[PDB]
Amino acid sequence: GAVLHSEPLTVMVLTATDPFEYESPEHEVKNMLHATVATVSQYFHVKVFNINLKEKFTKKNFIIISNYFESKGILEINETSSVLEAAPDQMIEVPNSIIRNANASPKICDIQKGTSGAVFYGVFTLHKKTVNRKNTIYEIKDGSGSIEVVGSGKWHNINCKEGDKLHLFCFHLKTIDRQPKLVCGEHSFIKISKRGNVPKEPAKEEDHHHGPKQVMVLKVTEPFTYDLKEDKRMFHATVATETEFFRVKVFDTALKSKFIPRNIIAISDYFGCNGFLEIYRASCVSDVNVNPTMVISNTLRQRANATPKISYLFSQARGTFVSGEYLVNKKTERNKFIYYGIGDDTGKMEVVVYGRLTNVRCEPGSKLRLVCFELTSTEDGWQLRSVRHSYMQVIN
Amino acid sequence: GAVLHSEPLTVMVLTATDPFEYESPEHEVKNMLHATVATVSQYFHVKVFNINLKEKFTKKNFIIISNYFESKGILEINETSSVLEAAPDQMIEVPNSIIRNANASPKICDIQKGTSGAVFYGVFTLHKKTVNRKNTIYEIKDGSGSIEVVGSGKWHNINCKEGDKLHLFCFHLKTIDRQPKLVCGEHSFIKISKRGNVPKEPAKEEDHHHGPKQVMVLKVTEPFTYDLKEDKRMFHATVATETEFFRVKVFDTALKSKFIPRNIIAISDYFGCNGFLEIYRASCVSDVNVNPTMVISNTLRQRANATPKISYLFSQARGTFVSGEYLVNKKTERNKFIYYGIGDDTGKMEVVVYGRLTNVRCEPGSKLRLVCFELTSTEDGWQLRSVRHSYMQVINA
Amino acid sequence: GAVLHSEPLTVMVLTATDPFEYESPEHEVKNMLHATVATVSQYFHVKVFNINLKEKFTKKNFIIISNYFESKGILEINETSSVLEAAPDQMIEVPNSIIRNANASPKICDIQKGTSGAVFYGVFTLHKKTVNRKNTIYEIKDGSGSIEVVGSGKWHNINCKEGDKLHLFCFHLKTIDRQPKLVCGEHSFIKISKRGNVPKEPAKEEDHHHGPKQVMVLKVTEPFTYDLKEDKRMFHATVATETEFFRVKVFDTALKSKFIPRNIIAISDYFGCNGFLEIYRASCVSDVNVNPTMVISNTLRQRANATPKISYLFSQARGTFVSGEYLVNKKTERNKFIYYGIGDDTGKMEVVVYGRLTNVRCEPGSKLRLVCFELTSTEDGWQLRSVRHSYMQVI
DNA sequence: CCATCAGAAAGAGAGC
DNA sequence: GCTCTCTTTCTGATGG
DNA sequence: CCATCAGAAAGAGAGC
DNA sequence: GCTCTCTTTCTGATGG
C-alpha cells in the first residue's frame, strides 16, 4: 500500500489547487485539494484529505510534516497527519532547478513507455474529444505523440472544446485495446485553461444554411442607396456570438430599429457569400430584446471592431474585403476617380474610389472609415478599390 | 571464475572518471567508477565498485593494491579489496610511453578481428546515429573501418550528435547478423568529447533531390506576395537537423500550417537555389510523427536564428543572401526609392529597397527585421539589396 | 574467398619494405613487398606481388590503383591490377592522423583477444628468444602484455637479440597450449631496428660500493702530479661496461700497467664523487679480464668519447666537471692566469688556466684536449677553469 | 572548460 | 668525422 | 466600456 | 559545448 514517513521533514509549497468535492474511500462526498513541494534536492506531489489545512497550503510558505503517507511516489496527508507552520529559522533552500523541473509537463511518447498502474501529472492541448454515454475519450497531443484519456465520474462530459490546455491531476495509465489509455482514479482533478483569441474575420460558408445564430449587435452603419437606378437601401453591421464575430450585409433597412447596438437577436436565413452573412428579409430577426444571453469577453469586442494593419493587409489574398479607420494625407482626382492616399505607423497605400462615393467630401487632415472594399495591388503599390457594397464616411 | 591477486602491487593512477550507477551482480543499484592505472612496465584498466575510494583514485597519485580481482586482463576492485595511498618515498615512475599508449584507442580493423565476448576501450567518431525503439545503434568510423555499437537501456539515445567524440568504456564483441557489434555490458560507460557546429550560412543544394529529410522549424514568418502581376504567394522559414540548419522557401501557402516552430516535419523531392531550398507542392511535407525524441542543439538554434555582424558581413563573398535583424538610423527617400542606413556595434552600412516594400513606414529608433537580401557594395561602403524574394517587418518599443 | 575491387582509387604511398622472397600458391618462390597506402579518409595495408611497381611504391608518391583485391580487409596487388602515376593536379591531402593510425601498432592485450587467423602488422620489442630445431619462439612485449611469435623457414633463427626491435608484417593467429600465439604465414616479413644501447652519462652514488663491475678500459692518461707539495700522483681513464661508460680517477698509479685500452678489469670498493668513480687502492683492480667476450657497442664507444657542443654547454648546470676537445683561437696571459679563447660551430668561450697547467705550451691554431675542468660563468661569458684534478694536453 | 591535436623543434640510428 | 632522416617531444591551438 | 499588470515561455549571459 | 540564471516578449487577466 502506502508507506509512512515519520521524520519531521521541512518543505516549501510551490503550487496548489482549490478545494473540490471528491469521493473518499468511505463513499462520502468530502473535499480535497492538490499541491507540490520541494526539498533541498527533490520534489514531491501531495494529496490533502483534510480540508482544514488550506491556509498552510499557500505558496512561498514553509511547513514541516510528520506521519505522512507515500503511495506510488505521492505523499498523502489526511486528517491524522501533522502539518505545522515553520519558523523563520527552519527554512530550506530550494535551488532554482527543482522549481523549473517540478512544473514541467511530460511528453506523451514517454507516457506510452511506462508500466500499467503509475500516476502522472501534466498539462496538454486537446486534439479531439469524443463524448460517450458515461465517459469520454479526450485525445491529447503534443510534439511527442498522441494518446487517449478516459474520463468518468465527476469528469465525464466536462465543459471544454477541441483545443484546451487540460491541466490534469493524478491519472492512472492502463493498457486498454492494446494501446496506451489514461483513466482517472479517485483523487483526480482537472483545471481547464482555454487560450481563446481569434482576429481576422470569421467567414462561415454553406449556402442556404438556415437556422439560429442569436448574436449581439455591436457597431452598425446608417442606411444608404447602392443602386441608383432602383434606389436600393442597405447597411452593414458587425455582430458577434461569444465565440466569433461576423460581418453582416443587411439589405432590408426596416431592421434599422432591430439592428441597434447592444442588442441581442437570433437571425434565420443566411447565405455565406464572400464571407459575409447576407440577410435578405426582416422575417429572420426576432426582437427578443428583453432576454439576456452573452457578454462577449472584452478581448473579443476589440477584436471584432479592430482596425486592421496595412502590414497585415500585405499578407492577405488579393480579393478579400476590409473594414477600418485610417488617416488621409493625399488626394488626387482623375476622370471621375478619386484616389485617397493613406497610411499609418506600419505602412502606406492608395485607396481608389469610383461611382456614387465620389460625393463623399473629404480632404487630407481628417480620418476616414471604410467598409467592404476589395483588396488589389499593382506593380507600384497596394489598393483598396470601391465595389458595389462599399460605404465610407469622414469622422471628427 | 576469475583470478585473485593477494599481494601488494604498486601502480600510478592515470585517468579516472566520475562516479556512476550500475546494476551490481545482485541486481542492486550501486555506484562505481572506471579508472586506468599503470605500473612501471604494464598499465591496467581498473574497475571500482566501492565508491568511497573516490579521493584515492586521482591522477598523479601513487597507490598500492592488495587482494584485488582480475578478468580478461583487467583489474577489478570492489568492497573486498585493499587500496592504500603510496607515500612519496614509495614512488614508482611510469614512463611517458605507457601514458601515450594507455589513452591510445585500438584501431577499428583490429576490433573487427577480436573474439566474441572480448572487451574494448577507446574514443571514436560518431559517423551516423540511429535510435531504435528498444536499443540504439551508433555507427562509428575511423582510418581503419566501421563498426556498429548496441546501446540499450542506460544508453538508449543519449545527449549527443554526429561528429562528436564518444568514449566507449567496456563494450563486448558479439557476432550479430554475421558482422561484429559492440553490445552493452554490465560495466558500460560513455563520456563525450563534443565537436562540430557549422555556423555561418546554411549549406549547399541538390537540384531535384530524390532523397528525404527530417528537420524542425525554428523561425517562421507570415506569408506574403512576391509578384504583383499574377498574385504569387510565399513565405520564409528556418529549419534544422540535429547538426545542420537550413533557410527555406515555400511557395504554396498551404504549407503554412505544417510549418510551425517546434514542429518535427519531413521534406522530399526538393530543389536548391542560391543557398535556399525551394519547395513547389504541398505533397512534400507530412508532419505525421517522424521522430518525437529529436533533440535540437540550443547553440544550433542560436546559430540559425543568428544575425551576423557588419564586420562579419564584410568578410563574406558577395552573392550570399542575408537574414537577421538590425537597427535603422538614417532615412533618405528619393525617386520611388527609399534608403535605410542600418548599423550595429561594429559600424554602419546601407540598405537599398525598391518597389512594393517601399510601402512600409519604418523610422530610425525601431528595429527592422530583414529576410533574404542580396549583399552588394561600392567604393563608399556596403549594402543589403532587396531582391525578388525579399521580406521584412518593423518592430519597436 | 577474396573479393575484387574493380574501381579506380587514388592513394598516397605511406610506407614500403624492401623486396623479399616468398612462396606463391603454386609453390614457386618469387619476390614481393609490403606497403601501406592511404586515401583522404582511410588507410589500407597492401601486399604487392609485382616487383616492377617498386618505383611507384615509394614514400610520398601519389599513385592510382584499379583491378585490385581484398582479403581480410587488406588489399592485394598482382599482375592483373593496374597502378598508374597520378598527375600533379590529382594529388590528395592525406591527413596526418591517417599516417599516424597506419604506422601505429596494435596493443598486445588486444592481439591476445583476436580470433584465429587474424592478420596483424606492427613493431614490437623482443623480450625473449628460444631457438628450436625447426622454428624459433620470439616472446615479444609491450606496455599491454607479452605474446609468443613463432617463426619458421626463412624467418627461423634470424640474427637478432633481446632488446632489438622487430617490425612484423602479416602474421596470423593460432592458439597453442591454450595460450594465444602469433605464427608466420605466406606473406610474413621481419625488419630489425637496432637494440637498446644508448648511453646518457654515468650515474652518481657515493657509498662504498663493495660490488664489482667488470668494465673494459677505453682511454687512459699518463700519470701526473696533481699536488706539488707532497708529489701526489693520479691519472684519468674512461671505461665502459656493455651498457654504460664511467669516468674513473685512479689515485694509485701502480694500476697504470693494468689500465691499457682494450684490457678488461674488475673494479671493486670504488667511490662516486662529483660524478666520477674513485679507486683508492691497488687491490680493487685485477688484470685478468675474466670475461674475454665483453663487447662495447660502437654506438656506446663513439657516444662515450663525444665532446659536447659549446651551445649545449651553455645549457648545462654550473659546477659540473667537463672533458672535451676544443680549438684554440686567442691566447692572452695576465699575472699567471692564461686565458685561452676556444670555440666551435656552436659558440665561443674562455678557458682559464692557473698553476701547474700553465706550463703546457699552447699557441693559436693548436687544439686543446681538456679533462676534468670546472664549468663557471661571469657577466662577460662562460669559462672552463683548471681545478685540483684538472689535466690537459695539446694534440 | 577540459583535454585533445598539430606545426614546430629536438634526438637516435644508418651511411659517405 | 659529418650529414640526411625517422622518431620523439613541448607548447601553442581549437572549440562553442 | 478600456488600460494597466503579471506569469509563462523563448532567447541570452556568466561561468563550468 | 553545457548549465544556472538574468533578461526580454507574447498573450491572457484586472477593475471603478
Textual characterization of the structure:
Three copies of one chain form a homotrimer. Chain A is mostly beta strands and 396 residues long. Chain A has four domains: 3-99, Beta Barrel (OB fold (Dihydrolipoamide Acetyltransferase, E2P)); 105-193, Beta Barrel (OB fold (Dihydrolipoamide Acetyltransferase, E2P)), CATH 2.40.50; 216-301, Nucleic acid-binding proteins (OB fold (Dihydrolipoamide Acetyltransferase, E2P)); 307-394, Nucleic acid-binding proteins (OB fold (Dihydrolipoamide Acetyltransferase, E2P)), CATH 2.40.50.140. Helices cover 5% and strands 43% of the residues of chain A. The first copy, chain A, has four helices and 31 strands. Chain A has helices spanning 99-102, 108-111, 299-304, 310-313, and strands at residues 3-5, 9-12, 15-16, 20-21, 31-38, 43-48, 62-66, 68-71, 74-77, 82-85, 119-131, 136-142, 145-150, 165-176, 179-193, 216-220, 224-227, 232-240, 245-250, 266-267, 271-273, 276-279, 285-286, 322-328, 332-334, 337-343, 348-354, 367-373, 376-377, 382-383, 391-394. In chain A, the strands form seven sheets. In chain A, strands 1, 3, 4, 5, 6, 8 and 9 form a seven-stranded mixed β-sheet that branches. In chain A, strands 16, 17, 18, 19, 21 and 22 form a six-stranded mixed β-sheet that branches. In chain A, strands 24, 25, 26, 27, 28 and 31 form a six-stranded antiparallel β-sheet that branches. In chain A, a hairpin with a 2-residue loop joins strand 25 and strand 26. Chain A starts with a strand and ends with a strand. Chain B binds four DNA strands through residues 96, 100, 103, 123, 159, 165, 192-197, 199, 261, 297-299, 301-302, 305. It is classed as immune system. The entry lists the keywords DNA sensor, PYHIN family, HIN200 superfamily, innate immune receptors, immune system. The assembly is heptameric. P204HINab-dsDNA complex structure.
